[PDB]
Amino acid sequence: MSDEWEQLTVELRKIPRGTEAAPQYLRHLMKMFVADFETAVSKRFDVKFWNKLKSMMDEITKAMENDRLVNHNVQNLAIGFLTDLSLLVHYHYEIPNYGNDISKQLTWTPDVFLNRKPIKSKKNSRVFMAYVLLRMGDLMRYKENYPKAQEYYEQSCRINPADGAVWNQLGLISSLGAKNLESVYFHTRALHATMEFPTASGGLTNIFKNFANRDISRPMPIKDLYLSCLGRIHFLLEIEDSSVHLQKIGEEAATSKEMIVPLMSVYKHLEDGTELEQRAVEYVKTIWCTAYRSLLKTLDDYKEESKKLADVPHLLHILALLLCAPKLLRGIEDQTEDEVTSICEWLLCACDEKIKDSDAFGYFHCLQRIQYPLTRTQLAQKLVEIEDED
């Protein structure tokens, strides 16, 4: 690095630590940002910024016996600092537009700036913007404005899905709204993202515990049944009736990524050998295969009624996810052969070669081995491979 940045670095490190000396540090981080946004993001100074801020919030929250008035004060201070960070970055550097749905308080418009230094490498701007949005989301969550928090979170996730933290926070929001299924899905995505947010594991466990010991025999909504059964798979417990329940669950899971994705994670972890692990993996096999059958039939019927291929992107992606576990699909090869052949013919002769996921797989690394983005041909090749091994 140059001499100026090194000097600013020494000046940064000289600054003491602590609850009270932190605003000085934050403002100096702002100065170092404006000085060299590129290099600043290179060393992830956004993380350091949020670390000092979160520090402040925590220490002040604790030292005041969790008083509400102090809480609100330090929270609004935080909001101010972060917003001003985003705006100060915009003021000096040509930050690309990432959506007009993004709040203009962090963004403003290109019409209000004069001479901005051009962005050299877009990765920096992407990661930075996504991170800022993420932390503004956190701040909105602390202030108990859940809708806004969800907006910030979804935007952040869209800009950079490769950060598992965002998925985890989305999971937290889902849990707050008593939406347990979506929470499980999000926490799973956080667990197996490109950055891998390990803490999410705990979260998942916390949910599993709350469902593994429910009277499965008793009546309940489908999603809850999936939760209890997945929970019983995780803790190596015997699924009461099994057959009927697993059947219905698979039938429902044929159309929802929020059941398929968490199932992959539990499968990959379980993927070994024990007296109980065998049973659990067999449960998983039942559900998985049922889903595979149902989905195959549905897609085939969509081929029948001449639905355009682009009219079923998500449904093709669930299929490709199902194909990520070939060892689970052994045994039903012959039965599904015809449907597979027809669907493969459909895929081969077409739409152009790309299937919009919008669920951002490829930034999902649990048991993948499928090169993204999803190619119209590659999917067919995968199906053909699954049938061929027999």
């Binding site: 605003p23 403002r27 008035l69 609004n76 600092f81 917003t83 705006l87 915009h90 209000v112």
Partner: protein, 399 residues
């Protein structure tokens, strides 16, 4: 019935803020609580229909401005003023962050004030400028933003400064009186061009006093201007022409159509001269089109005495110079627009061009917007041909 409950609560909270503001410290739990309550009610007020403003001003003044003012007059505070200001900013960010807020410009201007209050050499101070700009991008009616922008900014010409102040006076909600502008007009400049510009601004703003002396002085200004245009080697006049356009527009708003008409004459003469030189700075055309647009608009409007448009009360030679000007402008537009074609629904923001003036040298979409707006006028001097082989995009009309 809920209206009375809300109104009573907000009034009470504001009264209490004003009262306990003097006695307590700025970090008082009481005052902060009162602020929270105040905003809480003010939101439900903003939900209604009505100018409001007075309420927002009340809460801003007794809740934010006064406590900060008292805060400065204290040697016993450990906290840096910039930090407190930042907290205030994050606190007021709630209004902007809430959807369906009726007055974003106001809040942006208040946060802008917060950033303006920060001590010099503090980085966060920069944003001040930006904030005001944002306010203007939300609503060009807030002239105080134009004034403060004319004060804060460093990287601007005398032309741009005058532009900002004048725009501050043009706005529907203008910056008090306009004494400051005159005061700046009192200050002499160090270059011939800017001296001329200031001269014209003073003359344009000058009331009917010294009726004949007005005419003679005006003539002198026109001659000095022409002399300067011919004498100078070449420099972009679009800044000065923008300034003169805005100034003349202000003269129209301030007095009458005649007072404006003198300016119209002067500026028309100037433009015809500059185009007579055939020198073609890319920035000038953008301003020339704008001036044609505004002038046409004013000429279209009926007179205060009614029964005729303002265009009808024009001398023959005036209409002659007018049509000559329009011919020149159209010719240059066509000269530029060979194989560039017409952009439809450009939807380009005018904010940047309004704040900074024409320094950029325009792109095709931007020009397309203005040219569209010109043919949109109630009485269009130009009109696009339905189908063109090569040239003649726009052709003269209503002359």
């Amino acid at each position: 019935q809920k209206s009375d409950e809300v109104t009573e609560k907000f009034k009470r909270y504001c009264n209490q803020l004003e009262k306990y503001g003097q006695t307590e410290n700025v970090h008082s739990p009481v005052m902060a609580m009162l602020r929270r309550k105040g905003r809480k009610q003010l939101i439900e007020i903003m939900k209604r229909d009505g100018d409001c403003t007075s309420s927002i001003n009340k809460l801003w003044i007794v809740g934010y401005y006064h406590p900060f003012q008292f805060f400065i007059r204290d040697k016993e505070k450990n906290m840096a003023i910039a930090v407190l200001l930042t907290m205030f900013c994050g606190e007021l960010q709630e209004m902007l962050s809430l959807p369906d807020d009726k007055y974003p410009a106001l809040w942006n201007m208040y946060i802008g004030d917060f950033h303006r209050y920060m001590p010099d050499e503090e980085i966060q101070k920069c944003l001040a400028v930006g904030y005001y700009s944002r306010a203007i991008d939300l609503d060009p009616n807030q002239g105080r933003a134009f004034h403060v922008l004319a004060g804060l900014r460093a990287d601007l010409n005398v032309a741009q400064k005058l532009r900002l102040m004048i725009l501050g006076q043009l706005a529907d909600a203008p910056y008090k009186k306009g004494t400051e502008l005159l005061e700046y007009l009192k200050f002499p400049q160090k270059e011939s061009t800017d001296k001329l510009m200031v001269d014209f601004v003073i003359w344009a703003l000058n009331e009917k006093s010294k009726r004949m002396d007005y005419q003679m002085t005006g003539i002198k200004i026109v001659n000095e201007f022409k002399a300067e245009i011919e004498q100078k080697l070449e420099f972009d006049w679009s800044l000065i022409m923008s300034t003169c356009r805005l100034a003349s527009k202000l003269a129209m708003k301030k007095f009458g159509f005649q007072q404006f008409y003198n300016c119209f004459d002067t500026i028309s003469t100037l433009y015809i001269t500059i185009y007579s030189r055939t020198i073609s700075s890319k920035c000038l055309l953008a301003e020339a089109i704008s001036w044609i647009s505004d002038s046409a608009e004013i000429l279209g409007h009926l007179d205060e005495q009614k029964n005729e448009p303002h265009f009808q009360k024009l001398s023959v030679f005036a209409k002659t110079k007018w049509n000559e000007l329009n011919d020149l402008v159209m010719n240059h537009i066509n000269s530029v627009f060979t194989s560039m074609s017409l952009t439809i629904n450009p939807s380009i923001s005018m904010t940047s061009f309004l704040l900074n003036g024409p320094i950029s040298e325009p792109n095709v979409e931007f020009l397309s917007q203005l040219i569209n707006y010109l043919v949109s006028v109630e009485f269009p001097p130009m009109e696009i041909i339905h189908d063109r082989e090569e040239s003649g995009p726009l052709l003269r009309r209503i002359n």
